Design a protein around this nucleic acid. Structure first.
Ligand SMILES: N=C(N)c1ccc2nc(-c3ccc(-c4nc5ccc(C(=N)N)cc5[nH]4)[se]3)[nH]c2c1
Length: 91
DNA sequence: AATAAAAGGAAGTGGG
DNA sequence: TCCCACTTCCTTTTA
């Protein structure tokens, strides 16, 4: 099954949910969620995974935070903003 | 207060 | 057995 960081990168590449997520500086890999429209993106993640419960942005961001140590995705000191690693952006 | 963003410990679920 | 890669639950903290 697809990994969360890959789901997000795929969305950013396709533009399919541009009202929920967008690049801030794509060269740096920084991206930002919509305050008002992030829940619809979280719902889509849960449905893609076939999880038992409805996915929420809160639970999706809980998963995102686990990438902090390994480095695939890091939180940026800006509202609803995160940053992919160079490895993730290259691969 | 109401609302939201951010955090993280801990236990549960998948598929190896 | 026991890690993967989250998911789910609950509580706290800050703005
Ligand atoms: N509404 C808003 N416009 C808004 C905008 C930006 C915000 N940036 C925050 C936070 C930053 C740090 C926070 C925090 N540091 C913690 C340490 C420990 C724990 C714990 N559970 N031990 C919890 C913590 N939370 Se909250 N809140 C914002 C709100």
């Amino acid at each position: 099954k697809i990994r969360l960081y890959q789901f997000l990168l795929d969305l950013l590449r396709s533009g399919d949910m541009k009202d929920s997520i967008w690049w801030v500086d794509k060269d740096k890999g920084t991206f930002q969620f919509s305050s008002k429209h992030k829940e619809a993106l979280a719902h889509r993640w849960g449905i893609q995974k076939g999880n038992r419960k409805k996915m929420t942005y809160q639970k999706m961001a809980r998963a995102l935070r686990n990438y902090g140590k390994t480095g695939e995705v890091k939180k940026v000191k800006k509202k609803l903003t995160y940053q992919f690693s160079g490895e993730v952006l290259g691969r």
